[PDB]
Scaffold this active site. Structure first.
Site, PDB file in Angstrom:
ATOM      1  N   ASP A 109       0.867  -1.172   0.000  1.00  0.00           N
ATOM      2  CA  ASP A 109       0.000   0.000   0.000  1.00  0.00           C
ATOM      3  C   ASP A 109       0.906   1.225   0.000  1.00  0.00           C
ATOM      4  O   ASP A 109       1.733   1.385   0.908  1.00  0.00           O
ATOM      5  CB  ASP A 109      -0.943   0.006   1.213  1.00  0.00           C
ATOM      6  CG  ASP A 109      -1.787   1.292   1.324  1.00  0.00           C
ATOM      7  OD1 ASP A 109      -2.551   1.594   0.383  1.00  0.00           O
ATOM      8  OD2 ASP A 109      -1.757   1.967   2.369  1.00  0.00           O
ATOM      9  N   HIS A 143      -9.577  -2.238  -7.775  1.00  0.00           N
ATOM     10  CA  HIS A 143      -9.495  -1.150  -6.805  1.00  0.00           C
ATOM     11  C   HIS A 143      -8.859   0.097  -7.406  1.00  0.00           C
ATOM     12  O   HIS A 143      -9.408   1.198  -7.302  1.00  0.00           O
ATOM     13  CB  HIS A 143      -8.706  -1.596  -5.571  1.00  0.00           C
ATOM     14  CG  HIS A 143      -8.575  -0.526  -4.534  1.00  0.00           C
ATOM     15  ND1 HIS A 143      -9.663  -0.004  -3.864  1.00  0.00           N
ATOM     16  CD2 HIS A 143      -7.489   0.133  -4.061  1.00  0.00           C
ATOM     17  CE1 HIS A 143      -9.250   0.925  -3.019  1.00  0.00           C
ATOM     18  NE2 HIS A 143      -7.937   1.022  -3.115  1.00  0.00           N
TER      19      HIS A 143
END
Ligand code: HEM
Ligand code: HEM
Ligand code: HEM
Lengths: 306, 306, 306
Positions: free
Chosen positions: C143, C217
């Protein structure tokens, strides 16, 4: 503006120096693979922000004009030296200077550039280099004592100035691998090695004017302009070697004026007119050599997007 | 611009503080040996770029006019305190602040300055200092909590501004060695020691206005101008000591206005006019003291080349 | 200007994220306790200048006008989502982002704020968070890859510009805790997980356009302005969890324009108008969520002193 990222920071512990000719690679494919290098560079920076991940991509005179239809002022190919010693020229289209605190990251960046084109290009050399003890050359002498140290000095010496237009914050690269004859070197007394280099071996203290001979290495590589002002370059050289074969120094310098490097090479190899050559050249041999232009990061981006 | 290199960075773990009088050393010889210090400084920076190698060289008011023909504004010698406690004044011509992450490098810079002139100068003191646990003074209290911390704040407080001309980015030094009476100090309850300093011992939390006495150390060293705005100094003090003998704090501050230090010392030693003195002076003793001017690195270079 | 200290630096290893409602705490008491937080932060920075001690204090739209006479333009509360998935809004008056290289420092700053007011406020959450292996979410995916990375880029993305007046160098915060269903996630093949995310799992290499599905996403969170330019946010999200209970990501972003977050959430939850939603939302659940304004450090000081 912005110099490419490897130029200004102090040297990291690991590097790879790549010189290549395009062979079967097209200009568009070259742009794609520089972009692939940049992509992996950017990705690993996000994952390893302390790993000092840095690079510069630079270009030979011929391929440069294929990327950007204007030469930076003074850009030209290195000329051979036919002096007391010979210095060769090996022209290359692309030079890549990769550096990092980590050897695996240096490899990852090279891998990224070469993925799928290993047989399409002709790599002249991919030289793996490493800091050698406390910043020394394998002669045992410290390398870098008189190199510009402050950020602002390094930028002033290396980078083309603002009135170079799009060429501002680019830099000229001189890259040349040396192989040492350490067996010949090691038979000398330490005092004699210090006479050859011009600095002391343990400390790198400069020899006095009385004691330093005219043919010492740093007597030949210290050069002045018309006004007698010293002219400087930004060196990034790093040792390399294998026990089984060549061991030496990968010499590299960044400069805003290749005429400075011409003059130092003339004085080292014995073509300067004053009858003198660098005594260190009795113990080290240049095996390649070329001049390149490293654009600014912004000009490189313009080229990649064109 | 450029402040001398030790002023702005946060403190390193090791230091040497030198005060001396020229005695038999000539001004020419002094410039030579500053240059020798600078030469070893520069050489070791190249070899140890992460060792935080820093220094400042500063001059007494008496000798400054023999080095430069103009006096920075507000430069005078420290004045004696005829207060509750006495403060000595011991003038010195040269002050040298050496700092590094490494004790050996601190020694190497001092060795470089003194080589061949140990008997020509009169050294008042060469104090080896060290960071003491988590930045504490040997009383056990943290030293530095209210020191300027941001780079910009540190520069604003310590350095002469641009309108000072050649004197811009110079700084005035106050240096004073203290010996502590730890035998007396350790007989106090901790609650009393906190009354004396004005902050808590473990945490350095400031005592509330209701609890802090008017004779607490930091009640006396907090000073404000005619407009009620606080005036600050940049401290670089460091502990020193030997088990067999004297132990204490080498106090040193850098400031753009020596009048601020005059006021703090007046309030400390009891000559400010409110009749109050610093209770901490019942437990520590100044052993010397002087004011100096530290030029910018540029002005120092001009002095060295002149 | 000056952004609050946690916004611009790269993420540290430990954080605490606090959201609260004032309940019985007065505005005056709130300022006192923010000041106590700042005092402990300042004191610890002096003692541990390498411990990356950072924080941001931010305020909900409902309370902001009780603290300052003017709303920054566009400030508003988070709106709920009723899409393919639901997103409640959980408004809060005060948000505190605490970060450091050390967990004990993070606790110390939270302790200082809350000392003596634990039963006066309504704490919605105080989430302890930690960097998870090489910057990964507990899904196993890195991330941060496309987050702004250079300091100047991070500043341009997160901070209100100079023409925002007193609000310049402030930032809007969106904070929202997610719980993951790892048992459901781990039943997938890795290639399917990579379809869901849009990047590869080990390396975070972006999937090619032809292989990335529309409901991945990063297909949903990559957003574009009317003129075709991608709109960015500065994320500071960090994992949290306990073996016995909830495990997930504490999502937090800093932005100069909350309309960017609005569009991102609409696209993710399925209310943007194209009828598509983020497939990752089949495996994670939002558990709170709100918008805040973090003033510049100078504007925050004005509020504290008023
Ligand atoms: C195997 C080959 C070489 C070795 C082992 C070597 C080694 C050294 C050493 C020990 C020094 C003194 C420390 C320092 O100031 O860096 C030095 C200085 C220097 N060398 Fe070399 N060098 C080599 C080749 C070259 C080449 C090809 C050039 C290009 C012209 C060059 C340019 C310089 C310069 C500019 C300096 C700084 C001198 C000064 O300004 O005082 N060197 N080198
Ligand atoms: C043995 C001698 C001394 C000792 C042990 C000592 C110790 C301390 C301590 C424990 C503090 C509180 C922590 C801090 O804010 O740094 C402090 C603060 C301070 N000291 Fe000293 N000190 C000594 C001498 C001096 C002298 C001679 C001066 C100035 C002429 C001075 C100026 C200051 C100042 C300006 C502060 C900051 C006060 C504030 O602004 O809150 N100190 N000292
Ligand atoms: C548990 C919840 C979430 C997880 C596990 C997650 C995970 C990820 C991952 C693995 C990436 C790719 C690596 C990267 O570029 O950082 C990413 C990117 C991103 N995420 Fe999320 N995310 C979550 C929630 C959110 C939310 C709620 C938002 C905004 C409202 C958001 C906004 C973004 C953005 C803007 C990017 C960068 C996309 C790009 O420009 O390529 N994320 N996230």
């Amino acid at each position: 503006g912005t110099a490419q990222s490897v130029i200004l920071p102090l040297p990291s512990d690991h590097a790879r120096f790549i010189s290549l000719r395009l062979k079967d690679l097209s200009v568009a494919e070259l742009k794609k693979h520089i972009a692939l290098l940049h992509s992996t560079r950017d990705r690993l920076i996000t994952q390893h922000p302390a790993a000092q991940i840095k690079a510069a991509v630079a270009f030979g005179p011929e391929i440069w004009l294929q990327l950007y239809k204007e030469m930076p002022s003074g850009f030209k190919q290195l000329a051979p030296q036919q002096g007391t010693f010979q210095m060769p020229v090996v022209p290359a289209d692309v030079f890549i200077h990769i550096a990092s605190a980590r050897a695996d990251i240096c490899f990852a960046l090279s891998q990224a550039f070469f993925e799928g084109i290993k047989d399409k290009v002709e790599v002249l050399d991919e030289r793996v280099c490493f800091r050698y003890f406390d910043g020394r050359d394998i002669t045992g002498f410290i390398d870098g004592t008189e190199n510009p140290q402050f950020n602002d000095d390094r930028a002033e010496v290396a980078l083309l100035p603002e009135d170079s237009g799009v060429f501002a914050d680019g830099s000229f690269i001189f890259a040349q691998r040396y192989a040492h004859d350490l067996e010949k070197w090691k038979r000398l007394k330490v005092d004699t090695q210090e006479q050859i280099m011009g600095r002391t071996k343990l400390e790198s203290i400069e020899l006095d004017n009385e004691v330093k001979p005219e043919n010492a290495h740093i007597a030949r590589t210290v050069v002045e302009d018309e006004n007698g002002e010293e002219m400087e370059i930004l060196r990034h050289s790093l040792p390399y070697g294998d026990g089984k074969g060549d061991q030496g120094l990968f010499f590299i310098a960044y400069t805003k004026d290749l005429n400075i490097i011409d003059l130092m090479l003339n004085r080292m190899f014995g073509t300067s007119g004053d009858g003198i050559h660098d005594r260190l050249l009795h113990f080290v041999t240049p095996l390649d050599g070329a001049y390149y232009f490293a654009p600014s990061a912004e000009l490189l981006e313009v080229i990649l997007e064109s």
